[PDB]
Every structure is written in structure tokens, then in C-alpha cells.
């Protein structure tokens, strides 16, 4: 049973799942857009939305929290100075997931892009 449980497991134990999201966060905030598997993309949305929202708060506390996940002082700076400001008036939903048409050859995995919104 899984009744009203929230969170995918993605066939990773606790520390790997976590590193998986953090690394995907870095990737998304770095490039503005990445491609992955649909379920990974769907989990990313929230993990990153929170960091974008914390960046919108702007305070030092907020910076030090974001930095637990993102680690890169420069990256966070970009997040704080370039990314957060485009979302000042946007209330949540800073990321979007659109599904790709073609599956990956080697394993038939369905793909999707995840990207920061306008």
C-alpha cells in the first residue's frame, strides 16, 4: 500500500534520490532547459520551484538555504540576480514540463523537457 503517500522513489535510496534532484536542479538553473525522463521531470518542478521561490525572498537566510542544495556560490548568485527577478510577480509555477514525442532507443524511455518559464 502507498495510500496518500507523496513522492516518487525513482529506484534510488535516500541519499541518491536527493543528489539526483540537486544535480538536476543545478542543471536546470544552469541551462534554463534540460531533457530527462518524464517522471524525473515531474519531480523536478517542485524541487526547483522552492529554490526559485526562496531566491525571490532574497534575504541571506534564503541564500544559505538554497546553497545547501545548490552549493555553487556563482550559480546561486545567478539564481538570485537573473532568475528570481523575472518571477517577482509570478506566483509559483516557475517551471514547466512538456513531453517529447520520441522515446530513447536503448531503453525506450519516454522523454520530456523541463524548463524555467518566461
Amino acid at each position: 500500500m502507498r495510500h496518500l503517500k507523496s513522492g516518487r522513489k525513482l529506484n534510488r535510496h535516500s541519499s541518491h534520490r536527493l543528489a539526483l534532484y540537486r544535480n538536476q536542479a543545478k542543471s536546470l538553473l544552469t541551462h534554463g532547459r534540460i531533457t530527462t525522463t518524464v517522471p524525473k521531470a515531474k519531480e523536478l518542478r517542485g524541487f526547483v520551484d522552492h529554490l526559485i521561490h526562496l531566491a525571490k525572498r532574497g534575504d541571506l537566510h534564503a541564500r544559505r538555504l538554497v546553497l545547501r542544495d545548490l552549493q555553487d556560490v556563482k550559480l546561486v548568485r545567478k539564481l538570485f540576480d537573473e532568475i528570481a527577478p523575472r518571477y517577482r510577480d509570478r506566483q509559483g509555477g516557475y517551471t514547466r514540463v512538456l513531453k517529447l514525442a520520441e522515446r530513447r532507443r536503448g531503453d525506450g524511455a519516454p522523454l520530456a523537457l523541463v524548463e524555467l518559464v518566461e
Partner: protein, 59 residues
């Protein structure tokens, strides 16, 4: 355990009746409203990069 094993060879009739559920269903496809190329619904069009009436992607 004690190593179970088929008692009789399965007849061609039986084998093939097991396969009565094996036919693939064809991909469900809808036209891309921009470039009319056939594609999966809910996907960004891989011919033209369009989805929700806009250009999403270089193709």
C-alpha cells in the same frame, strides 16, 4: 523446492492460444495542427517543434 518441470510438450494449438493476447496496438497518433504531420497526442511536435500553438523547440 523440487524442480517443477512441464509434464507434456505444449501443443501448437495451446501455445498459440496463449498468444491470443499478444498483438500490439498501433501507436495512437493525432495530426499536428501546425504542420499536419502525424504525431502522439500530448507531445511537442517533432516535425516542427510546435506545441499549444507556439514554437517550443528547434527541430
Amino acid at each position: 523446492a523440487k524442480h517443477p518441470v512441464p509434464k507434456k510438450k505444449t501443443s501448437k494449438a495451446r501455445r498459440d492460444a496463449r498468444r491470443s493476447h499478444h498483438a500490439l496496438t498501433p501507436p495512437t497518433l493525432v495530426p499536428c495542427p501546425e504542420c499536419k504531420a502525424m504525431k502522439p497526442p500530448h507531445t511537442v511536435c517533432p516535425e516542427c517543434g510546435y506545441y499549444a500553438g507556439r514554437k517550443v523547440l528547434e527541430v
